C-alpha cells in the first residue's frame with residue numbers, strides 16, 4: 001500500500017512559476033512555450049515495489065518506472081539525460097535529477113483532494129496543482 005494516496009489519474013489545474021523554473025533548468029525558448037502550454041495528466045500506479053508515473057499531454061508523453069531509493073536513467077520531457085532517484089520521505093515523493101553537475105528536485109504531495117507538485121532549481125520554485133480526473 002506504498003503510495004496508495006498517490007495512485008490514480010490526475011489532471012493539471014493550475015501552475016505558477018513554471019516558465020521561470022524551466023529557464024533556471026536551461027530549457028530553450030520554443031520548448032518552454034509549448035511545454036508551458038501543456039495541461040498534462042499524471043497517472044500513478046503501483047505494482048509490488050514498482051511505481052510507474054506516466055505524464056500525458058499534447059507536448060510529450062513520458063513514462064518512468066522505478067523502485068524507491070534505486071537510481072535510474074531518465075530522459076526528461078525536455079530531452080535531458082538525467083540520473084534520477086525517487087524516495088518517499090515523510091509521505092512526500094521526492095524525485096531528484098542529476099545531470100551535467102546540476103540538480104533539480106520535484107516533490108509530489110497529497111494536500112486535501114489535490115496532488116501538489118513542487119519543482120525546484122536553485123532558488124526558483126514552481127508549484128503545480130493537480131486534481132483527480
Ligand SMILES: O=c1cc(O)ccn1Cc1ccc(Cl)cc1
Pocket residue numbers: 022027031035055076077078106117119128
Ligand atoms: O513531469 C512533470 C510534471 C509537472 O507538473 C512538472 C514537471 N514535470 C517534469 C517536466 C520537466 C521539464 C519539462 Cl519541459 C516538462 C515537465
